[PDB]
Design a protein around this ligand. Structure first.
Ligand SMILES: *SCC1=CC(C)(C)N(O)C1(C)C
Ligand SMILES: [Cl-]
Ligand code: NA
Length: 164
């Protein structure tokens, strides 16, 4: 298991524009196109992201290219962020993947706001961090995914993803 396989499980793969859990236009492996309610605004963002007139459909290779870009942007984003970099540097490799997963889903600003959870992760208080992370809109809105990410921070193993 690695971050790519973990996110593929959590996000799925869809080659036509769809709406995510929040109702936003998305494509591929969790690639948000726009928060706008217009399908035409979403098709324009998609064509710009891919570099051709797609008419709302992409290939598997194009979805994987967007995914590679998005993972790389999440990692570079964490490492440029003064609040997240210290947390990332403190963690083992499995727990680093759980932090990337959260940034990929929420964005850097959303994760930097989990102030108390950050501090507990930096202190290696795994069970206390797990409890604090679950007291969130994130957990209440996507509990199965959140439970897998929380388990990963609690244990430092891939157990929540093995058998999927
Ligand atoms: S959650 C962002 C964050 C990380 C850490 C370095 C522990 N910081 O004290 C805050 C809480 C800003
Ligand atoms: Cl879920
Ligand atoms: Na998704």
């Amino acid at each position: 298991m690695n971050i790519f396989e973990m996110l593929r499980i959590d996000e799925g793969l869809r080659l036509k524009i769809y709406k995510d859990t929040e109702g936003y236009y998305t494509i591929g492996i969790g690639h948000l196109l726009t928060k706008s309610p217009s399908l035409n605004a979403a098709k324009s963002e998609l064509d710009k992201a891919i570099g051709r007139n797609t008419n709302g459909v992409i290939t598997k290779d194009e979805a994987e290219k967007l995914f590679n870009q998005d993972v790389d942007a999440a990692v570079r984003g964490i490492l440029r962020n003064a609040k997240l970099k210290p947390v990332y540097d403190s963690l083992d490799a499995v727990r680093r993947a759980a932090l990337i997963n959260m940034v990929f889903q929420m964005g850097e600003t959303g994760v930097a706001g989990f102030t108390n959870s950050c501090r507990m992760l930096q202190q290696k208080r795994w069970d206390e961090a797990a409890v604090n992370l679950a007291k969130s809109r994130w957990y209440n809105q996507t509990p199965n995914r959140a439970k897998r990410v929380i388990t990963t921070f609690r244990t430092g193993t891939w157990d929540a993803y093995k058998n999927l």
